[PDB]
């Protein structure tokens, strides 16, 4: 005979944005109505001190600058797929036999496992996109040291 020992399913490990150290670099705000808007602007108002000049030299003026900061959009996507077997068995029963029960259990577990994997992948994609937008804007060392 041919002997098959214990079969193993992968013990996939979960990860989250908040649990990662990168979350400390970030501020995270959730907003259920984000789909409707595409503009986010912040404004800064600053008055710069001027030292009173000496005799004869040109004098300074009361001066201010006003500057605005804008938003970057970078949505992320993940696809996941279901076969016809799971889709038809998830909403049907055939004679109520034991094998049909096995198929129903398999279909339900398959779709829910796919949903769980997609959620984990979405969290990974969110942290990935945050790193992308952070790194794409960071200048190198020599320029900042020269500055």
């Amino acid at each position: 005979f041919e002997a098959i020992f214990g079969t193993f399913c992968n013990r996939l490990e979960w990860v989250y944005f908040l649990t990662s150290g990168l979350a400390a670099a970030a501020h995270a705000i959730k907003f259920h109505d984000l789909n409707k808007l595409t503009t986010g602007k912040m404004l800064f108002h600053v008055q710069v001190p001027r030292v009173a000049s000496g005799a004869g030299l040109p004098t300074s003026r009361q001066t201010t600058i006003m500057v605005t900061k804008y938003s970057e959009k970078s949505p992320i996507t993940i696809p996941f797929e279901l076969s016809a077997a799971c889709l038809t068995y998830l909403r049907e029963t055939f004679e109520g036999t034991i094998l049909d029960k096995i198929l129903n259990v398999e279909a339900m577990h398959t779709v829910l496992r796919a949903l769980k994997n997609t959620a984990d992948a979405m969290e990974r994609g969110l942290i990935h996109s945050f790193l992308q937008t952070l790194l794409r804007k960071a200048p190198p060392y020599f320029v900042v040291q020269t500055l």
Binding site: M108, L112, L115, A119, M122
Partner: peptide, 15 residues
């Protein structure tokens, strides 16, 4: 269908 499955196991994802 997804609602049916999550109802069946009584589980909630962030989605």
């Amino acid at each position: 269908e997804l609602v049916t499955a999550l109802k069946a196991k009584r589980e909630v994802n962030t989605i």
